């Protein structure tokens, strides 16, 4: 919003060094803020792409930066019979730089490590390493948690268990507030994903120059897993820290696994001991869900909110085509124990291949409005594909879908603008957090400074009615009496660190609706309908109020005496900019509008006092809990008094209820303009009833409202209905309260069929007959106490006329038949053969809890008894299987209306061929 | 156990 896209500071690095691949703010001891920039391809002393880190001091004009020197010589030591080796060529130093306190932590993800012992070696691989430095004291330290001295032969015999030879530690790094370094190793445990943590103090204390392989005492690493889902998940591709368990003492880690579960993606929230607390599965495969994760409080609730990026998400285009644009997921943290379900918002990029969500950077309170904001990056987005960064402002219920600002890449094409972002630090020290965007393609870093935000507050006060026969003032230069009314226009600008020379232009328009010659009201001073006051509010902590005189034109001049007079106040920054960027950004309600009208047929009293009556009647009384209830709130309005000005129908909707549409019975005005609004703590809908609601006018309004989320409520829900106007005496109608009962109900389908339904038996192993019973929870509410009893004739023995086999509860409802089915492991006019004739084989199928709309199917495997088929080959049999449905109770506060119960019959017709 |  208030980021300045004109005065940019550009920091440049060596050409082709990828200066800007990663960056962070560094605050030295003196308090000055410097920028730490990583250049993972900076040439080393041997003309090799070792990488480097640059510490850029804050300068208005930017420019070059002095490099932060790190050791870049390949090391080698002989410990006993082994020869530890370190290879720093193409190590990518600076690929991840994080600053904490006075320590700069730059990692080299692709640094190689190798151990030689006799002929056998350790299979030189990119273990990775991270370099720690204190720029003030000059201290240097290193941390390579995945270095080992185990030969490659040992790993083969142990099935590559605890194989950390390819961690690439430092791929993603973050330092907790307590001061514990957390490194992401997407390749650890054979590309399974690894996480390494160690206090920064212990890393410095335990570091010893010339010792390539040491062990930090307090370090803790993640755990290897045999679950195939985690295979090749790159667990640790991105890492973030935050609070997600309600205990401020403990710190929780947010780890992204962009290829978890066969390239599905996932973000895991785990405590300091790596015990998983919650997992957020990706939405689309190969979308790289979890590529970037950010933790911030975007709704001012005091609880951190999780943001996940999916750069390669392909949104379903309107033409049934998939377009790769990227997506950012917002997971607002609910109150109490974490219950993060579906994402609370879905920000989707627009430019194809833009990789929206590639980098997410919390911005703090960019506008100081009380809600934290974020800046999502599209390194290849924008109309020209040069990349852009979008700024989203937090609000009381998450983020705003519309990006408040869009920063376009000032660099050439293919600069990867916005690949790395960082904010929440006031670099220039003007009270507003600033943003720095890295573009390693152009080897430059762009610094965006946040400008002060002015919260303009415009208030226009004017009369409610005009009486032309009350001419008091006289037109200047003449004495022709006219009807004059006062117009008060209070303007107030407030903000933090705003300039003391703040000026505002307040434009007043009288009767803006009509054309210039159609204006009915004019100002006494200029005899014109409109003025532009220049208000300077520098140093003013209270609104500035100005008053003018507006007179009603002569009655014979204008014929329209019914259309309300509309007064507008525009307010805007002065054009003093003269081409330069305005030092401030005007924000808030800068445009107000108020109405006034000529006193028309208000009676001898010259005051319009209306009388308003309302009637409430709801249709669809049963509000089934868990069902998308739609209620028709049929209503009637009567203006039994005089004319009502700006008559509006007020409906107080509960949290579950939502306005859908409102239709009136007036042919000319059948559709009512309803404006949903969240009045103090209860949402309300304002539907117009005609601005000059005529006397003796009755309007019947039928509104459809969607009521949901009734589970977290009582037996009933009520609505507030009132008709409010802008008259002086009796402006509002009596509030009519309408209550609708809330009920929980559900129904279940009991159906089954025979496979085959009929099987002509020509008359042990023989014809195959199986019965399948399926239950569907079609009811709006969930079901609990699922019970089923199937009556199957027979004994599963030679006495049985139809051998039976194992019963399969596909839905998940186990049962026990009365006679033990399949005693042997081997699978060896019709008369109603019910279960009565033989021992009734009844299976106690119980599923207890049944999800809404869920279907459970139980099938029985049976075969006609071959010896029994031969005997009695002249008696047609129709094997009838009967089942009974049963429910304990709906799991709700009030599950009335009995419980679902069914009675279904399934039979198979043998059709004795030799009957 | 793991790999190609």
């Amino acid at each position: 919003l208030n980021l300045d896209p004109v005065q940019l500071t550009f920091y440049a690095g060596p050409n082709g060094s990828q200066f800007g691949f990663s960056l962070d703010f560094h605050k030295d001891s003196h308090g000055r803020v410097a920028i730490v920039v990583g250049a993972p391809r900076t040439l080393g002393p041997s003309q090799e792409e070792t990488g480097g880190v640059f510490l850029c001091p804050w300068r208005a004009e930017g420019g070059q930066c002095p490099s932060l020197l790190f050791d870049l010589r390949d090391e080698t030591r002989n410990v006993g019979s082994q020869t530890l080796q370190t290879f720093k060529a193409r190590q990518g130093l600076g690929a991840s730089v994080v600053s904490w306190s006075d320590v700069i932590v730059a990692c080299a993800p692709w640094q190689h490590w190798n151990v030689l012992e006799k002929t056998e070696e350790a299979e030189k691989t990119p273990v990775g390493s991270c370099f720690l430095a204190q720029p003030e004291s000059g201290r240097r330290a290193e941390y390579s948690p995945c270095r080992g001295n185990t030969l490659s032969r040992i790993y083969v015999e142990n099935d590559f268990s605890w194989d950390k030879r390819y961690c690439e530690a430092g791929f993603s790094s973050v330092v907790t507030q307590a001061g514990e370094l957390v490194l992401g190793a997407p390749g650890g445990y054979y590309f399974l994903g690894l996480l390494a943590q160690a206090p920064v103090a212990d890393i410095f204390s335990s570091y010893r120059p010339g010792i390539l392989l040491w062990h930090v005492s307090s370090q803790s690493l993640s755990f290897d897993s045999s679950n195939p889902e985690y295979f090749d998940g790159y667990w640790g591709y991105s890492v973030a820290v935050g609070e997600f368990d309600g205990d401020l003492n403990t710190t929780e880690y947010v780890v992204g696994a962009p290829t978890w579960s066969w390239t599905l993606g996932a973000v895991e929230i785990l405590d300091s001991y790596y015990q998983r607390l919650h997992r957020l599965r990706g939405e689309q495969m190969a979308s790289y869900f979890g590529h970037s994760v950010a933790v911030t409080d975007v709704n001012g609730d005091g609880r951190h909110d999780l943001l996940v990026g999916a750069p390669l998400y392909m949104e379903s285009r309107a033409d049934r085509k998939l377009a790769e644009v990227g997506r950012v997921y917002l997971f607002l943290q609910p109150r109490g124990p974490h219950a993060l379900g579906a994402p609370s918002l879905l920000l989707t990029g627009t430019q194809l291949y833009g990789r929206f969500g590639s980098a997410i950077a919390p911005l703090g309170d960019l506008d100081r409005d009380g809600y934290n904001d974020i800046a999502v990056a599209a390194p290849y987005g924008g109309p020209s594909g040069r990349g852009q960064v979008l700024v989203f402002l937090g609000q009381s219920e998450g983020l705003r879908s519309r990006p408040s600002q869009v920063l376009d890449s000032p660099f050439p094409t293919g600069s990867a603008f916005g690949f790395s972002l960082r904010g929440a630090v006031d670099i220039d020290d003007n009270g507003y957090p600033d943003l720095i965007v890295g573009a390693y393609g152009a080897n430059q870093v762009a610094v965006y400074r946040a400008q002060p935000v002015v919260k303009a507050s415009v208030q226009l006060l004017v009369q409610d009615s005009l009486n032309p026969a009350v001419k008091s003032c006289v037109l200047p230069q003449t004495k022709t009496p006219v009807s004059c009314f006062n117009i008060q226009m209070c303007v107030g600008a407030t903000g933090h660190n705003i300039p003391q020379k703040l000026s505002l232009n307040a434009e007043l328009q009288l009767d803006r609706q009509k054309p210039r010659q159609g204006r009915r009201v004019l100002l006494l001073g200029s005899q014109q309908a409109g003025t532009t006051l220049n208000l300077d509010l520098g140093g003013k902590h209270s609104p500035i109020c100005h008053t003018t005189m507006a007179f009603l034109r002569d009655e014979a001049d204008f014929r329209d005496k019914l259309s309300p007079i509309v007064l507008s106040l525009n307010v805007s920054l002065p054009p003093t900019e003269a081409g330069m960027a305005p030092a401030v950004v005007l924000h808030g309600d800068t445009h107000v509008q108020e109405q006034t009208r000529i006193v028309l047929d208000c009676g001898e009293d010259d005051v319009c006092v209306p009388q308003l009556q309302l009637t409430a009647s709801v249709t669809g009384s049963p509000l089934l809990v868990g069902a998308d209830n739609v209620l028709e709130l049929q209503m009637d309005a009567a203006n039994e008094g005089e004319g009502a000005y700006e008559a509006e129908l007020a409906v107080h909707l509960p949290q579950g209820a939502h306005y859908m549409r409102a239709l009136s019975n007036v042919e000319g005005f059948e559709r009512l303009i309803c404006n949903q609004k969240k009045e103090n703590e209860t949402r309300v809908v304002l539907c117009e009833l005609g601005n000059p609601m005529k006397k003796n006018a009755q309007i019947g309004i039928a509104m459809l409202v969607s009521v949901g989320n009734l589970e977290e409520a009582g037996e009933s829900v009520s609505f507030q209905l009132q008709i409010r106007s802008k008259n002086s005496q009796n402006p509002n109608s009596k509030i009519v309260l309408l209550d609708v009962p809330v009920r929980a109900e559900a129904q279940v389908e009991l159906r089954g069929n025979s496979f085959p339904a009929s099987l002509v038996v020509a008359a042990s192993w023989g014809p195959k007959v199986e019965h399948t019973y399926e239950l569907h929870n079609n009811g709006p509410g969930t079901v609990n106490g699922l019970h089923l009893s199937i009556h199957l004739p027979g004994q599963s023995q030679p006495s049985d006329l139809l051998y039976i086999l194992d019963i399969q509860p596909q839905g998940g409802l186990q049962c026990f038949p009365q006679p033990p089915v399949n005693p042997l492991k081997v699978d060896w006019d019709p008369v109603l053969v019910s279960c009565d004739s033989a021992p009734c084989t009844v299976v106690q199928c119980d599923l207890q809890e049944m999800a809404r709309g869920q279907r459970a199917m139980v099938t029985v495997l049976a075969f006609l008894w071959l010896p029994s088929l031969y005997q009695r080959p002249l008696d047609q049999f129709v094997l009838q299987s009967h089942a009974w449905f049963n429910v304990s109770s709906l799991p709700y506060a009030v599950p009335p209306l009995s419980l679902p119960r069914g009675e279904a019959q399934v039979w198979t017709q043998l059709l004795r061929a030799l009957e | 156990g793991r790999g190609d």
Binding site: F21, P40, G92, W110, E123, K124, T125, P126, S152, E168, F171, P186, Y190, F231, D232, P258, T263, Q284, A286, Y288, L312, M314, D319, R320, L322, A323, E324, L352, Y353, R355, Y380, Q513, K514, P515, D557, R559, D560, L562, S563, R661, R671, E749, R751, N753, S754, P756, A757, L759, V760, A762, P767, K768, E774, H776, R855, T859, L911 | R2, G3, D4
Partner: protein, 683 residues
């Protein structure tokens, strides 16, 4: 008559033509201040005003070129036509629609070139042995389907970078499997070995000289090879007039875009050919893996069919990928690639059995509704694809093009092309909004108040300030009025509280964020219902407060789609014949049936219940349904064959249907639907 043409417009020919397609205009000087100039043609013609001066443009579609569909294929490649007509010209008046039909044929003996892209990991050593003579075996099975067959070979392992590859000891760079006491080639990203050639013996020779290489991580760089094979048209040797099959054989997960960060590669993969004179992927070690979206763009652009010949352990992974890559088929591959020859033939037959249309470069002002005739003569509505076809079958699609208002471009052209077909239909749309009377325009005519306004088309279009029929009433000079028609009815608001009652006519307000129009300024284009924050769901234009939904969409909120492609189920019937289609979604009216396409039901009548009549329809041709066309329209099974009574491999529906002759018809249903009907039942 109180039609829309007379109510609105009545100001100029230009405005009335945009009122609605049915409106006309009379520029004749007759009827002075009488009947409205704009109305239905019969209304205008009925009241005289017909000196052949009525401007009533009619939308027309002309076939600029339509060669007949070639019936034989092969022969001369240039003359092989699979879509007819090939070019059509559309002239659409404002907010008008015109229907046009096209035909698509799967010509027999159409040339096909198959490019074999085989993963060469160490686990594919067994596979490479069975492929040894796949060139001749593939040729024999294809010569019965195509005269012109050309086969190429390509291999891939992974990026030769520090991870994914063994870089130590130094010997490992030359013999990666040296730690296993074996010899193998050094790792390579993608290696084109044999360009598409008709000499099938070359394929056998090249495969015999190939060898495997060993990498570290399970995922392979397969998608890198697919991109290079698709975009290296000259190197690979694709023929424009031929079916392009890209057999992609692998037995492991595949690296996707953004995986190159492990190797340090961050540059996005551009869809360019980087295969050099050495036939190796030059940018393998310096460019990231392609994304799914990029591959689909290049596969669709090059008209290449991708076949995932993968093994069992990754069949689901590539099946899920195939969902995100439309136009791809997945085939289960044996662990030794022993059934690849049958996999290719089945894949090719499946590819040629379907026709799906795609629209390219469609202007935003146009919408299209497609109806498919497919096999038989049932016109499934809102469907752009026909499945179940065999070679030689012709399907016809009826398309209606509707324009959103009057675009100012006046010349647009889009292409309708079936997926995988070189042939396409080029539609040239020429919008026609202004009328011919505008040519004889008088900027300052003495008729229009001594030339203070422009005269054209038999009426006066007055300039600013001056209003009236002859521009003689000014703007404010006639504030008083006595014959004013500002109020639509007595006692109603003048000009609907949105205009000025000057000179009788209602002059509408500035119409902020919109435009107020009408005899009483009642109509507008900013009052339509917004379904999800967009007026008319962004699938329609507001016309006097009514959402005039364009083609492809319908409903008061223009949010119900007319597309029924979602309903189309593997079964070949809309929503599996168990329900209808409501705005794409399936309504499973059939009891016990559910799913996205009402395809899965476990409590419905068994196959036998109905398949009994399917055999009675063809195997017997008696009783009924034989005259109802069900034996062909509905019965896609086979006629009486035998009763093997041993085909339980997959789909074993044992049915002892009893016929009218009392014979026990033992028929077995057996994912091409096949009915093993008994040759002769026993009574």
């Amino acid at each position: 008559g109180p039609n829309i043409c007379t109510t609105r417009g009545v100001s100029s020919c230009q405005q009335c033509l945009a009122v609605s397609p049915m409106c006309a205009w009379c520029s004749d000087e007759a009827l002075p201040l009488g009947s409205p100039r704009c109305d239905l043609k019969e209304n205008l013609l009925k009241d005289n005003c017909a000196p052949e001066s009525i401007e009533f443009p009619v939308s027309e579609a002309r076939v600029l070129e339509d060669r007949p569909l070639s019936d034989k294929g092969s022969g001369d490649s240039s003359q092989v036509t699979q879509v007819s007509p090939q070019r059509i010209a559309l002239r659409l008046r404002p907010d008008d629609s015109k229907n046009f039909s096209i035909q698509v044929r799967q010509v027999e003996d159409y040339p096909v070139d198959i490019y074999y892209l085989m993963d060469l990991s160490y686990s594919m050593k067994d596979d490479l042995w069975s492929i040894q003579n796949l060139g001749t075996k593939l040729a024999t099975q294809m010569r019965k389907l195509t005269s012109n067959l050309r086969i190429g070979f390509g291999a891939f392992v992974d990026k030769p970078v520090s991870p994914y590859m063994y870089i130590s000891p130094p010997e490992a760079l030359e013999n990666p499997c040296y730690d296993m006491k074996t010899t193998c080639l050094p790792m390579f990203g993608y290696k084109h070995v044999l360009t598409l050639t008709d000499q099938v013996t070359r394929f056998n020779e090249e495969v015999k000289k190939q060898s495997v290489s060993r990498n570290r991580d399970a995922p392979e760089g397969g998608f890198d090879a697919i991109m290079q094979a698709t975009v290296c048209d000259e190197k690979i040797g694709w023929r424009n007039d031929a079916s392009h099959l890209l057999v992609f054989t692998t037995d492991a997960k595949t690296h996707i875009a953004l995986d190159g960060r492990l190797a340090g590669i961050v540059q996005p993969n551009d869809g360019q050919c980087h295969v050099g004179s050495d036939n190796h992927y030059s940018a393998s070690t310096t460019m990231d893996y392609p994304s799914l979206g990029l591959m689909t763009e290049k596969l669709s652009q090059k008209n290449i069919n991708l076949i995932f010949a993968v093994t069992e352990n990754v069949v689901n992974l590539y099946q899920n990928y195939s969902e995100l890559i439309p136009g791809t088929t997945v085939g289960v591959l044996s662990m030794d690639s022993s059934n690849v020859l049958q996999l290719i033939v089945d894949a090719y037959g499946k590819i040629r059995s379907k026709v799906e249309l795609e629209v390219r470069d469609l202007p935003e002002e146009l919408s299209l509704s497609f109806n498919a005739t497919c096999l038989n003569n049932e016109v499934i509505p809102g469907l752009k694809s026909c499945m179940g076809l065999k070679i030689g079958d012709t399907v016809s699609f009826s398309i209606e093009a509707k324009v959103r208002g009057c675009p100012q471009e006046k010349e647009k052209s889009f292409t309708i092309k079936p997926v995988g077909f070189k042939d396409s239909l080029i539609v040239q749309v020429t919008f026609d909004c202004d009328c011919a009377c505008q040519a004889q325009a008088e900027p300052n005519s003495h008729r229009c108040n001594n030339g203070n306004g422009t005269f054209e088309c038999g009426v006066c279009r007055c300039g600013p300030g001056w209003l009236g029929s002859q521009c003689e009433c000014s703007e404010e000079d006639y504030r008083p009025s006595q014959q004013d028609e500002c109020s639509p009815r007595e006692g109603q608001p003048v000009c609907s509280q949105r205009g000025e009652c000057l000179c009788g006519q209602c002059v509408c307000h500035s119409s902020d964020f919109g435009k107020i129009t009408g005899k009483y300024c009642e109509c507008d284009d900013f009052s339509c219902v917004r379904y999800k924050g967009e007026m008319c769901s962004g699938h329609g234009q507001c016309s006097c407060g009514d959402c005039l939904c364009d083609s492809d969409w319908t409903g008061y909120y223009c949010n119900c789609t007319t597309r029924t492609d979602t309903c189309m189920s593997s079964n070949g019937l809309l929503c599996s014949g168990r329900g209808k289609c409501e705005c794409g979604s399936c309504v499973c009216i059939q009891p016990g049936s559910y799913g996205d396409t009402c395809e899965k039901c476990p409590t419905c009548p068994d196959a036998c219940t109905f398949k009994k009549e399917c055999v009675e329809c063809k195997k017997f041709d008696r009783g009924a349904l034989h005259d109802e066309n069900t034996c062909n329209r509905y019965c896609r099974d086979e006629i009486e064959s035998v009763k093997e009574l041993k085909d339980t491999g997959k789909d074993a529906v044992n049915c002892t249907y009893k016929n009218e002759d009392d014979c026990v018809v033992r028929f077995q249903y057996y994912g091409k639907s096949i009915l093993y009907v008994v040759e002769e039942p026993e009574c």
